[PDB]
Coordinates of C-alpha atoms in Angstrom, one line a residue:
Chain A
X1 CA 0.0 0.0 0.0
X2 CA 1.0 3.7 -0.4
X3 CA 2.6 5.5 2.6
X4 CA 2.7 9.2 3.6
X5 CA 6.0 11.2 3.2
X6 CA 7.7 12.6 6.4
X7 CA 8.3 16.4 6.5
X8 CA 8.4 19.4 8.9
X9 CA 9.6 17.7 12.1
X10 CA 8.5 19.8 15.1
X11 CA 11.0 20.3 18.0
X12 CA 10.1 22.5 21.0
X13 CA 12.9 24.5 22.7
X14 CA 16.7 27.3 29.3
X15 CA 20.4 26.3 28.6
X16 CA 21.4 24.7 31.9
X17 CA 24.9 25.8 33.1
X18 CA 27.6 23.0 33.0
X19 CA 30.2 25.1 35.0
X20 CA 29.9 23.0 38.3
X21 CA 30.7 19.8 36.4
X22 CA 34.0 21.2 34.9
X23 CA 34.9 23.3 38.1
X24 CA 36.1 22.3 41.6
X25 CA 37.6 19.0 42.8
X26 CA 36.1 15.8 41.2
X27 CA 35.2 13.4 44.1
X28 CA 36.5 9.8 44.0
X29 CA 34.7 7.0 42.1
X30 CA 33.1 5.7 45.3
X31 CA 31.9 9.3 46.0
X32 CA 30.4 9.5 42.4
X33 CA 29.1 13.1 41.8
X34 CA 26.2 13.8 39.3
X35 CA 24.1 16.9 38.5
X36 CA 20.4 16.4 37.6
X37 CA 19.2 18.4 34.6
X38 CA 15.5 18.9 33.6
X39 CA 13.7 21.3 31.2
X40 CA 17.1 22.7 30.1
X41 CA 18.9 23.1 26.7
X42 CA 22.3 21.3 26.5
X43 CA 25.6 21.9 24.7
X44 CA 27.4 18.4 24.7
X45 CA 29.6 19.7 21.8
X46 CA 31.1 22.4 24.1
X47 CA 31.9 19.7 26.7
Chain B
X1 CA 5.6 14.2 45.6
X2 CA 2.9 16.6 46.9
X3 CA -0.9 16.5 46.1
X4 CA -1.3 20.2 47.2
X5 CA 1.1 21.5 44.4
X6 CA -1.1 20.3 41.6
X7 CA -4.7 19.3 42.7
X8 CA -5.5 19.5 46.5
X9 CA -9.0 18.1 45.9
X10 CA -7.8 15.2 43.6
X11 CA -5.3 13.7 46.1
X12 CA -3.3 12.5 43.1
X13 CA 0.5 12.5 43.7
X14 CA 2.6 14.8 41.4
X15 CA 6.4 15.3 42.0
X16 CA 7.0 19.0 43.2
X17 CA 10.7 18.7 44.2
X18 CA 13.8 16.7 43.3
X19 CA 16.4 16.0 46.1
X20 CA 20.0 15.2 44.9
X21 CA 20.7 12.4 47.6
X22 CA 22.4 9.3 46.2
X23 CA 23.0 7.7 49.6
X24 CA 20.7 4.7 50.5
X25 CA 18.5 5.6 53.5
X26 CA 17.6 2.7 55.8
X27 CA 15.7 4.6 58.6
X28 CA 13.3 7.6 59.1
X29 CA 11.6 9.4 62.1
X30 CA 8.1 11.1 62.1
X31 CA 6.3 13.9 64.2
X32 CA 9.2 15.2 66.3
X33 CA 7.6 18.7 66.2
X34 CA 6.0 20.2 69.4
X35 CA 3.8 23.3 70.0
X36 CA 4.7 26.0 72.6
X37 CA 1.4 27.6 73.7
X38 CA -0.6 28.8 76.8
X39 CA -3.6 26.8 77.9
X40 CA -6.1 29.1 76.1
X41 CA -3.9 28.9 72.9
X42 CA -4.0 25.0 72.9
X43 CA -6.4 23.6 70.2
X44 CA -7.0 20.1 68.8
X45 CA -4.2 19.2 66.3
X46 CA -4.5 17.3 63.1
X47 CA -2.2 14.3 62.7
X48 CA 0.1 12.7 60.0
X49 CA -0.4 9.0 59.1
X50 CA 2.4 6.9 57.5

């Protein structure tokens, strides 16, 4: 059967700061440190 | 999760806050609060049920 053609993908876009991750003393692997991010734009390319 | 944040009447549970604690918690305590009041000030108090 015929199928529709995909077009006009819709993406809905605040840039969360990544400064704490790259700043300060990283804790040891047992003291694993993570930052939770929600509803924020990301720049993985910069990291 | 707090019902009051979204619908108080519904009683449904919706997350209102995220706590960054990655430590396992094996124990908790409840109702350590107390009221400082004169005899006239004292009134019946509602309670919390776990």
